Design a protein around this ligand. Sequence first.
Ligand SMILES: C=C1CS[C@H]([C@H](NC(=O)/C(=N/OC)c2csc(N)n2)C(=O)O)N=C1C(=O)O
Length: 260
Amino acid sequence: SAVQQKLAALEKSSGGRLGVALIDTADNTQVLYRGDERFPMCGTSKVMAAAAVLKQSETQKQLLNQPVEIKPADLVNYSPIAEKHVNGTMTLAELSAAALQYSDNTAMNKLIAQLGGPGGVTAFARAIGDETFRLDRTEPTLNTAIPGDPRDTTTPRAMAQTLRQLTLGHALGETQRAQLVTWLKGNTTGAASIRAGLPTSWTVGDKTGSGDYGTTNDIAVIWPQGRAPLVLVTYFTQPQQNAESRRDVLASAARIIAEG
Ligand SMILES: C=C1CS[C@H]([C@H](NC(=O)/C(=N/OC)c2csc(N)n2)C(=O)O)N=C1C(=O)O
């Protein structure tokens, strides 16, 4: 298709490897580019962790209000919210919002621990029908994004399907889904990624990720006014371990999708 030709040209211009999956919920049509290749998820994996804790809260009614200690030894790099509460506590709701809206890495580690380890996050993915997602490590090493490494990867096709089930479908209870949607719409890290390529009248909830090899990721649910919502995954990674981030590639992929 012509959208695929434009995505391939964007990828050729970028020097890296681009993965795109679009679901148009109006007719369940999809656009895939490298849609079955694995990509390092980096922080886009935090959506699965927050969702798995929300699922637990369907039976543990007050789980989101449970305090969790933030100790000095817990603090890993890029933890701007948790660092403010060292030697104090944050609730699981606050940790979920921090992991999702600021990509706080310590917050993610608290979600992983609540689930019993990385295997607990993968377990939730399998429980909702995602056979592809795998979380293998904690923060910060899950972002090493080593070429070919299957650890901490998924495919664009699988992550788009999962993000649809979590936000627009019924993988979660009604109030849990609404809470996840609120958190994603309130993300603070996404202005230069998918959001930057879309008409500004469209409502967007998204979660970014970044890692070594210039890995630059974003997954989004998109509400245009007057049409059914879309789900868009944009994954990007590069050959050089010290490559710069390329959020412009993600914005440009979104702009191409919105044109088609
Ligand atoms: C705003 C950030 C950066 S901190 C967070 C996290 N990424 C890393 O900690 C990371 N970034 O490297 C550029 C890393 C860890 S180890 C390694 N080699 N690299 C993540 O992706 O969850 N996410 C976002 C985001 O884009 O949302």
